[PDB]
Amino acid sequence: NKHQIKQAVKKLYDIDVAKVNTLIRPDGEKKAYVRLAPDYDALDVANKIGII
Amino acid sequence: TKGTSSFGKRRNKTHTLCRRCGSKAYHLQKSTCGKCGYPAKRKRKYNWSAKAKRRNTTGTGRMRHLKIVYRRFRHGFREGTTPKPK
Amino acid sequence: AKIKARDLRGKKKEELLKQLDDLKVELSQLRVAKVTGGAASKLSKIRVVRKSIARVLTVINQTQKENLRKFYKGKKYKPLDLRPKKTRAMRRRLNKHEESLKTKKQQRKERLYPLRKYAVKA
Amino acid sequence: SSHKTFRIKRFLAKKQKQNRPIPQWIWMKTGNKIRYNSKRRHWRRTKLGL
Amino acid sequence: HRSGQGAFGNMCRGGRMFAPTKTWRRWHRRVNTTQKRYAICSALAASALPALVMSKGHRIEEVPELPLVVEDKVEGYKKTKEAVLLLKKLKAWNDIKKVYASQRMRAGKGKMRNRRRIQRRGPCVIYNEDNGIVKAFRNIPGITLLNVTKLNILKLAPGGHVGRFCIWTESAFRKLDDLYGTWRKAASLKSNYNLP
RNA sequence: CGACUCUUAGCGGUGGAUCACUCGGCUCGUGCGUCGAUGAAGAACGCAGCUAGCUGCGAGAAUUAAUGUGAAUUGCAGGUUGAUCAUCGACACUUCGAACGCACUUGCGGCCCCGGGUUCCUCCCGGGGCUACGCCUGUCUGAGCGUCGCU
RNA sequence: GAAAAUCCGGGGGAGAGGGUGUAAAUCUCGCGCCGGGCCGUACCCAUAUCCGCAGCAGGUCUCCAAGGUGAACAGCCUCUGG
RNA sequence: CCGCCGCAGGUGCAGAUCUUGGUGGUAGUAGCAAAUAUUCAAACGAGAACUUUGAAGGCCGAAGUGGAGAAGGGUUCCAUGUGAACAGCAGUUGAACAUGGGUCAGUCGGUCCUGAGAGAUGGGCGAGCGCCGUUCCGAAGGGACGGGCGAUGGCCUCCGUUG
RNA sequence: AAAUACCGGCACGAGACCGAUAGUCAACAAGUACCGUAAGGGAAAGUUGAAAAGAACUUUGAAGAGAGAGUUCAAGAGGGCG
RNA sequence: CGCGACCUCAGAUCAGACGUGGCGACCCGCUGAAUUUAAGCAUAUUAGUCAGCGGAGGAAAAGAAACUAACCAGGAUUCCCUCAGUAACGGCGAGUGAACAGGGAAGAGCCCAGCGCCGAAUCCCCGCCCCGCGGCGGGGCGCGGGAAAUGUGGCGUACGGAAG
C-alpha cells in the first residue's frame, strides 16, 4: 500500500512522510515517490542513507 | 472483400489467458477454457490426441511435491528422525 | 563475524531477532551500495548476508517447532502441521492396533488348530 | 492498449526482461554452446500472442 | 519448416520405414534333441584328430597328445599362477600366447555397441567337479570352462567350425562313456540315447 | 594470336555429402510399484555480484539446516572450529489451480484477536487467526392440526 | 423510444426532551479537526508502431475545424499546424 | 579397417508432378513508374541526390498529410552511442542495434450499478462427466426498535460493547 | 493371498538395433522457436585442437577486410572452424 | 394453553472425521461407431473394437459350486499347454467360434443374516490420572453422555449346527 510504504520509510529512516505517490514500472517493480514533511531535507537524509 | 479488407476489422479478442493452464484459450463470452475447461472441476483431456496429452502431463512441469515423494519413498517415508550427530 | 548455526541455537529468543535486524539493516545498506554503483568487495558480501539471514530465520523456526511438538506431545489433538505428513493414502490406512485386531471366533481357531511344524519320511 | 489489466502488465513486464542479449562472459564458460540469444522477439516480427 | 513437407511413407524424410521391424519376428529356433546330440558327437570326435584341431588354427605342435587329459588335481587349482604354469608344461601355452597376439579392435559399429575388444578362442578345459578350476583359469584369455554333463555346441565347435582344442580332466574323460555310451552300451546319463 | 564457347586437369570457391566419432534414441528384461484439502498434477510470477534461455529454486528464493565427504568454486571478480560436492530425515515452501469468505477486477466483505498512532474509543492503519461444498458420528438449537402422554 | 445502484421530498406521529435553567433533547446553519487504500496512466492510433506473412494504394470507432469564392462541410486557392 | 568359412538383413536407384537439402540456366534480366517537386549554400563526417541548419520554390488546404483519443500493439516513447545485419538506392538517418532512462491521481478512468443476457444452490433430469432451470416443486430473514434478568470501560456516574 | 497383467511412474541391466535426412517430434536453451482466434500444428540445429596455445606486435584502410609476423604435428584445423 | 416423551424433518464458522482433483501402461463398470470385408449391398464382418463417460489398485477382477459330468466319476478362482480353428454360429456366404475332460503354475480357505440360547453379555464419544506412539494405542476413575430390543456382542452357517 501507500500506507505500508509510509510506515516503512518512517521506521527505517527515522523521518516523516507528507505523501506517497506509487507507480508500477513497465519493468514490473513498484516505484514509490515518497514526499517528505517540510521539517526534513531530502538532500540531507539522501546523504545519510548513502546515495549521491 | 472476404480476405485482405476483412482482416482489418480483427480488433477484439475471443480468448484470453486461462488461469489453470496459462494458455490463451479462455473464451470471454462462453467463460470456458478451450484447452482445460477452467470452471469445469476436471481437466479437459481427450484420448484422441495422444500428442496433446503428453504436452500437459506429470513430466511437463516441476513436480515440486511429486519429485520429493520419489526421493522420500526410497527411505520408507521416514518422519521426525535426524541423522546421528557429530 | 562468520555466523554458523551452532552458536545461534543455544542463544535466547529476542537475542536472535536483535541479530536478525543487525543483518537486515546490513543487507539494505549493501543493496544501496549495489545501486550507488561501487565496491565489488561489498557486492560479494550481499550473498553472504542473504544466507546468514536464512541461517538465523531457520534456527528461529527450528526452535519454535521443537518447542510446539514438545508442547503437543502428550495431547490427543495436535495441529495439522505437527501430524506425520507422509502420503495421503498411508494416513488413511488402519492403525498399527486396528490391523492387529482378530475376532473372538478367529482367536479360538488360532488356539485350537495352530499350524504344526512337521516333516514326512520319503 | 493504454487501459490495461494488472495481470497483462505483469505478463508484458516479464516479456521485456527476457528480451535482452546474453552477457559477454556467458560464452567464456567451460561447456559453452550458446553463441547468441535465439529467443529474442521484435515487436513488428513476432506478436507475443493475445 | 515442417509445414507442407512429407510425413508418411518409406521415402519421406522423417516418415516411417518400410515394414517396421516388430519384436514378434521369430527370433528363436528349436533343434531336435537327437540332432543337438549328434552335433556334440562330431565336435568331440573332431577334437581327437590334430589334423582338424590345427586346421581350426590351435597351436598344438608341442602338445603331447591331442585328446590331452590331465589329473583330477587340476580341479583343486585356486590361483591362476598354478593354471598358467600347467599350460606351460602341457605346452598348450603358445595357444594362449597366440590369443594375446589376436587381441585387436573390432571393425565397425560393434565398438559403440559394447563389442569393442575382439580376440581368438583358446583351449576349452572340460572338468567333472569344480574344486576351484573355474576361478583358477577364467582370467587367462581364450580359455572357456565346460562341465562334462553340460557340453555346449556354441563352445566345443565355435563359429560352426569343428575341432576346437580341448583339455580334459581324468574324471571328465571317464564320464563320456556314460554320457554318450558306446555302440554296444547305451548312455546311462541319458534316458534313451545311443551314438549315431 | 582474339573474345566467346566446350572438354579435361591442377588450384581456389560454393555447398555440406562421405567417413570416423556419440553424455541420444529404440527394443527386450529385472526390482520396485509412491500423488492430493497436512493443498496434488499443471500454471503464473519472482529469485544469482555480474544472468537472457535451460536448470535449480520460493521473499530463508541457482538455496537454510543436518549428516557423509575433506579443499575447493571458477567465465570474471570478491572474501579444516569445514571450502565444495553428495545425501537429505529438520525447517521453510509467493500467486493461481480439486482451489475453499464472496467475486475474478486482483475487486468487495463479515467475525474474532493484537499493536500503533493511542491513552479501546468509535473511526483509521498494519498484522494474526477464522469464514467453500458434500457428508458421517456426536453436540446444540428451535420446527410440526406426526404419534401420544400429563394436568 | 431502458433498467438498477444511488439520492431526496412528503403523509403519518410510536417516541424524545427540560421545568424557567450553568435550560434539555435536537439542528440538512456557519466554521474548525481527521482520512481517502487498490489497479490503469509512456508512445503509435496510421500511405511506417494495429490487421492483412512486409514501412502492403486494402481494412480499422471517434473528437476539434480559419480566410477567400460560393447554395454549400462541393471543388479551387490561402493562414495556423504539418 | 579388412581377407577367408559360416550367420543375419531396414542390403545395390535415374525416374515415382518421389522425400529432404543444395545449385544452375533464365539474368545482372523482369523490375525498383498510383496520389504535381524540388533547388541553393553551409555544418558534422573517411564518405552526402537522401542527414541536420538557413534560404527559395511547392503540396496537404480545418470532411487535413493538423492536434488528441478508443480498440489493437507492448516499450515501439526518451536520450546517448553504433553503422555488422535489417530499413528492396543510399544513409552521418530510423520504429534497426547497444546502452541507459521514462507512465506519480479522494476529484481521469477502473472499481459500484444494472442492460440484453450469463449463471450457482433448491428442485428436476441424467449410465455418467453432468445437463435443465432462474423463481420455478424450497423451513430461502442471522437483521433493527424496546425490555428485564447479568456483565464489564470510565470516581461501574451511565452509556459503548455485548449474554 | 498366491500363480496372472503392466508401451504410465521410480530405479536398473542389457542388445547380431539406429548412428545426426538414421534413431523418439526432440543427441543441442525441444514439445523449444514459429504458426493458428482456438482446438491444435510443430521444426531446423552434433564435431577447432592434445592443450586456447583462439593469432601479441607491425603495416594499409573509416572499416569490414588484407599483407607480414606468431601458436600448432597441422590453420593444407582461424571461434557454424574434423 | 402449558410442560415430559417419541417420531419425522431443519439450522449451525457446533466437536471430531471423511469425500472431491491428478495420473491413467495394466484393471472394473457402462456407452459405442464407421472406415473396412463380403469384389455391389442392407443381415453379417470390422466389433462390444476406436472414440465418449465413470471407478480403482500395486495389481485389479474373479473366487470356495443353485459347478463339471454321465465316469470306476471329478471338486473355489486365476493363469499356461492342449482340447481347437474343434462342437456350434453364419445372406450356412464372407467370415465367426467357445467349453469339458487331460497335463502343469499356484494352491487356502472362510463369514453373516435367518434359526435359537445367554439380565446389551455389545459398541461409540467426552473429562481426569498413569504409561505412551511423527500408524492415538494401553491401564485406572466417574448415577459422564450416547447409539442399540425397529436387535449390539459371544456360540453357530449347510462340510450340518445346538442343547443336555
From Swiss-Prot, chain A:
Record localization: Cytoplasm; Nucleus
Any one GO biological process: translation
Keyword Ribosomal protein: yes
Main localization of the protein described in the UniProt heading: cytoplasm
Domain of life, per lineage: Eukaryota
Gene Ontology CC, one term: ribosomal subunit
Annotated family: Belongs to the universal ribosomal protein uL23 family.
Entry domain remark: The N-terminal beta-like import receptor binding (BIB) domain mediates interaction with IPO5, IPO7, KPNB1 and TNPO1.
Post-translational modification: N-terminus is methylated by METTL11A/NTM1.
Entire protein: shown range: 105 to 156 of 156
GO molecular function terms noted in the UniProt entry: rRNA binding; structural constituent of ribosome
Subunit and partners: Component of the large ribosomal subunit. Interacts with LYAR and GNL2. Interacts with MDM2; this interaction may promote MDM2-mediated p53/TP53 polyubiquitination. Directly interacts (via BIB domain) with IPO5, IPO7, KPNB1 and TNPO1; these interactions are involved in RPL23A nuclear import for the assembly of ribosomal subunits. Interacts with IPO8.
Job of this protein: Component of the large ribosomal subunit. The ribosome is a large ribonucleoprotein complex responsible for the synthesis of proteins in the cell. Binds a specific region on the 26S rRNA. May promote p53/TP53 degradation possibly through the stimulation of MDM2-mediated TP53 polyubiquitination.
Keywords (A to Z) from UniProt: Acetylation, Citrullination, Cytoplasm, Isopeptide bond, Methylation, Nucleus, Phosphoprotein, Ribonucleoprotein, Ribosomal protein, RNA-binding, rRNA-binding, Ubl conjugation
Organism: Oryctolagus cuniculus (Rabbit)
UniProt name for this protein: Large ribosomal subunit protein uL23
From Swiss-Prot, chain B:
Binding site for Zn(2+): C18, C21, C33, C36
Pfam families (alphabetical): Ribosomal_L37e (PF01907)
Sorted UniProt keywords: Acetylation, Cytoplasm, Metal-binding, Phosphoprotein, Ribonucleoprotein, Ribosomal protein, RNA-binding, rRNA-binding, Zinc, Zinc-finger
Annotated SUPFAM superfamilies: Zn-binding ribosomal proteins
Similarity comment: family membership: Belongs to the eukaryotic ribosomal protein eL37 family.
Subcellular location: Cytoplasm
Entry annotated with the keyword Metal-binding: yes
Signal peptide: none
UniProt-recorded name of the protein: Large ribosomal subunit protein eL37
Record-linked InterPro entries: Ribosomal_eL37 (IPR001569), Ribosomal_eL37/eL43 (IPR011331), Ribosomal_eL37_CS (IPR018267), Ribosomal_zn-bd (IPR011332)
Main location: cytoplasm
Membrane-crossing residue ranges in chain numbering: none
A GO MF term: structural constituent of ribosome
Gene3D superfamilies: 2.20.25.30
GO CC term (a single one): cytosolic large ribosomal subunit
C4-type zinc finger span: 18-36
Chain's role: Component of the large ribosomal subunit. The ribosome is a large ribonucleoprotein complex responsible for the synthesis of proteins in the cell.
Gene Ontology biological-process entries: positive regulation of signal transduction by p53 class mediator; translation
Lineage of producing organism: Eukaryota, Metazoa, Chordata, Craniata, Vertebrata
Positions carrying N6-acetyllysine: K9
Assembly information from the UniProt record: Component of the large ribosomal subunit.
UniProtKB/Swiss-Prot annotation, chain C:
Annotated GO MF terms: mRNA binding; structural constituent of ribosome
Subunit and partners: Component of the large ribosomal subunit.
Compositionally biased region (Basic residues): 85-95
Similarity field: Belongs to the universal ribosomal protein uL29 family.
Ranges where the record places region Disordered: 84-122
GO terms for biological process, alphabetical: maturation of LSU-rRNA from tricistronic rRNA transcript (SSU-rRNA, 5.8S rRNA, LSU-rRNA); translation
Keyword Transmembrane: no
Primary residence: cytoplasm
InterPro entries given in the database record: Ribosomal_uL29, Ribosomal_uL29_CS, Ribosomal_uL29_euk, Ribosomal_uL29_sf
Placement of covalent cross-link Glycyl lysine isopeptide (Lys-Gly) (interchain with G-Cter in SUMO2): K24
Keywords: Acetylation, Cytoplasm, Isopeptide bond, Phosphoprotein, Ribonucleoprotein, Ribosomal protein, Ubl conjugation
Modified residues (N6-acetyllysine): K18, K42
Native species: Oryctolagus cuniculus (Rabbit)
Upper taxonomic lineage: Eukaryota, Metazoa, Chordata, Craniata, Vertebrata
Phosphoserine: residues carrying this PTM: S28
Localization in the cell: Cytoplasm
Claim: Zinc-finger is one of the keywords in the record: no
Name of the molecule in the record: Large ribosomal subunit protein uL29
NCBIfam families in UniProt: L29
From Swiss-Prot, chain E:
The family this protein is said to belong to: Belongs to the universal ribosomal protein uL4 family.
Annotated source species: Oryctolagus cuniculus (Rabbit)
Sequence position, cross-link Glycyl lysine isopeptide (Lys-Gly) (interchain with G-Cter in SUMO2): K155
Annotated protein name in UniProt: Large ribosomal subunit protein uL4
Top-rank taxon, per record: Eukaryota
Post-translational modification summary for this protein: Citrullinated by PADI4.
Known partners and oligomeric status: Component of the large ribosomal subunit. May bind IPO9 with low affinity. Interacts with RBM3.
Positions where N6-acetyllysine occurs in the chain: K22, K175
Modified residues annotated as Omega-N-methylarginine in this record: R13
Modified residues (Phosphothreonine): T182
Protein localization: Cytoplasm
Task of the protein: Component of the large ribosomal subunit. The ribosome is a large ribonucleoprotein complex responsible for the synthesis of proteins in the cell.
